[PDB]
């Protein structure tokens, strides 16, 4: 068997370029988008984290409660991106024997709003997919179940867009080797998406329209945005017992280039920052 593990660090802007080369020395970039020709913005990742007036989800993730869910809508690339991923992270304590999970399904941007409000049913979302005998049956059911469970808590717990997480991501990995997988997130940004202010920043839809992927979004009030000082490095290892992680990774991770901040969260940070007034619990990194 083998052991998995991941660590998150902060990287000062001055060290980014150096760090980036050291990584590339051993780990070529993962393209992941081999189909549509190269685009500048193809490295962008935006995620609208959902939560309610009580920040139930926030505290759940903060404390890492058994079963604590995080709900976000994510799109890869520029604003001309149509496919929208409805993702849910579910934390599970170790004593459960199970391990935390991330699951998602795809929606066309058209139907996003209608789905969050219940006007667009799970039946409709996947009717287009059931029509194609391609996807395995039990595999479609799980996607339908997931879509249902999401639409459920999205309504029962009265969730809404609360905080946006934007950043450019670069991933690294030697093909056919999973011993080490790295990702480097730059120009990280959190912007308010809520209305706990009287201000309707979303104007009744799942995402702000006054912005897109135009970093560093200067048209935003300082009160609505948090330009994150550092880049975020995440190293994900997988080691067969009796074997070691590549000496260069150990060496790099222990260097002055990085600054370990395990269990750091773009979502938790963004909320704790932009909405400090109404939170009574705060992360360790501040």
UniProtKB/Swiss-Prot annotation:
Its main location: membrane. The keyword Glycosyltransferase does not apply. Mn(2+) binds at residue 234. Disruption phenotype: Leads to a decrease in intracellular arginine, consistent with a role for polyP in vacuolar arginine storage. Keywords: Cytoplasm, Cytoplasmic vesicle, Endoplasmic reticulum, Isopeptide bond, Membrane, Transferase, Transmembrane, Transmembrane helix, Ubl conjugation, Vacuole. ATP binds at residues 8, 72, 74, 89, 102, 167, 169. Induction: By low phosphate. It is found in: Vacuole membrane; Cytoplasm, Cell cortex; Endoplasmic reticulum membrane; Cytoplasmic vesicle, Autophagosome membrane. One of its GO terms (biological process) is engulfment of target by autophagosome. The keyword Cytoplasm applies. The active site is at residue 266. GO terms for molecular function: calmodulin binding; inositol hexakisphosphate binding; polyphosphate kinase activity. GO terms for cellular component: autophagosome membrane; cell cortex; cell periphery; cytoplasmic vesicle; endoplasmic reticulum; endoplasmic reticulum membrane; fungal-type vacuole membrane; vacuolar membrane. It comes from the Eukaryota. The SPX domain has very high affinity for inositol polyphosphates, such as myo-inositol hexakisphosphate and 5-diphospho-myo-inositol pentakisphosphate (5-InsP7), and moderate affinity for inorganic pyrophosphate. Its affinity for inorganic phosphate is 2 to 3 orders of magnitude lower. SPX domains may integrate inositol pyrophosphates (PP-InsP)-dependent signaling to adapt cytosolic phosphate concentrations to different metabolic situations. Belongs to the VTC4 family. Catalytic subunit of the vacuolar transporter chaperone (VTC) complex. The VTC complex acts as a vacuolar polyphosphate polymerase that catalyzes the synthesis of inorganic polyphosphate (polyP) via transfer of phosphate from ATP to a growing polyP chain, releasing ADP. VTC exposes its catalytic domain VTC4 to the cytosol, where the growing polyP chain winds through a tunnel-shaped pocket, integrating cytoplasmic polymer synthesis with polyP membrane translocation. The VTC core complex is an integral membrane heterooligomer composed of the catalytic subunit VTC4 and the accessory subunits VTC1, VTC2 and VTC3. The complex exists in 2 different sub-complexes: VTC1-VTC2-VCT4 and VCT1-VTC3-VTC4. The VCT1-VTC3-VTC4 subcomplex is mostly found on the vacuolar membrane. The VTC1-VTC2-VCT4 subcomplex is observed in the cell periphery, probably ER and nuclear envelope, but localizes to the vacuole under phosphate starvation. Each subunit contains 3 transmembrane helices. VTC1 is a small membrane protein without hydrophilic domain. Present with 8710 molecules/cell in log phase SD medium. This is Vacuolar transporter chaperone complex subunit 4.
């Amino acid at each position: 068997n083998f052991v998995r593990q991941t660590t998150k660090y902060w990287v000062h802007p001055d060290n980014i370029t150096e760090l980036k080369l050291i990584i590339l020395k051993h780990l070529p970039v993962l393209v992941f988008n081999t189909n549509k020709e190269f685009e500048r913005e193809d490295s962008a990742i935006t995620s609208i984290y959902f939560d309610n007036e009580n920040l139930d989800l926030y505290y759940g993730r903060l404390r890492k409660d058994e079963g604590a869910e995080a709900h976000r809508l994510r799109w890869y690339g520029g604003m001309s991106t149509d496919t929208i991923f409805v993702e849910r992270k579910t934390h599970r304590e170790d004593w459960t024997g199970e391990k935390s999970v991330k699951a998602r399904f795809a929606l066309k941007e058209r139907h996003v709003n209608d789905f969050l409000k219940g006007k667009y049913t799970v039946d409709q979302v996947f009717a287009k997919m059931r029509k194609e005998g391609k996807k395995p049956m039990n595999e479609i059911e799980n996607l339908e179940a997931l879509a249902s469970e999401i639409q459920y808590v999205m309504l029962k717990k009265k969730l809404r867009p609360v905080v946006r997480s934007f950043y450019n991501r670069t991933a690294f990995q030697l093909p056919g080797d999973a011993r080490v997988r790295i990702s480097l997130d730059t120009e990280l940004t959190m912007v308010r998406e809520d209305n706990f202010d009287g201000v309707d920043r979303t104007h009744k839809n799942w995402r702000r329209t006054d912005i897109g992927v135009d970093w560093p979004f200067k048209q935003l009030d300082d009160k609505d945005i948090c330009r994150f000082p550092y880049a975020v490095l995440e190293v994900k290892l997988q080691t067969q017992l009796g074997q070691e992680p590549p000496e260069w990774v150990r060496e790099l991770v222990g260097s002055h280039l990085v600054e370990p901040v395990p269990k750091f969260s773009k979502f938790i940070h963004g909320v704790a920052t932009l909405l400090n007034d109404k939170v009574d619990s705060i992360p360790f990194w501040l």
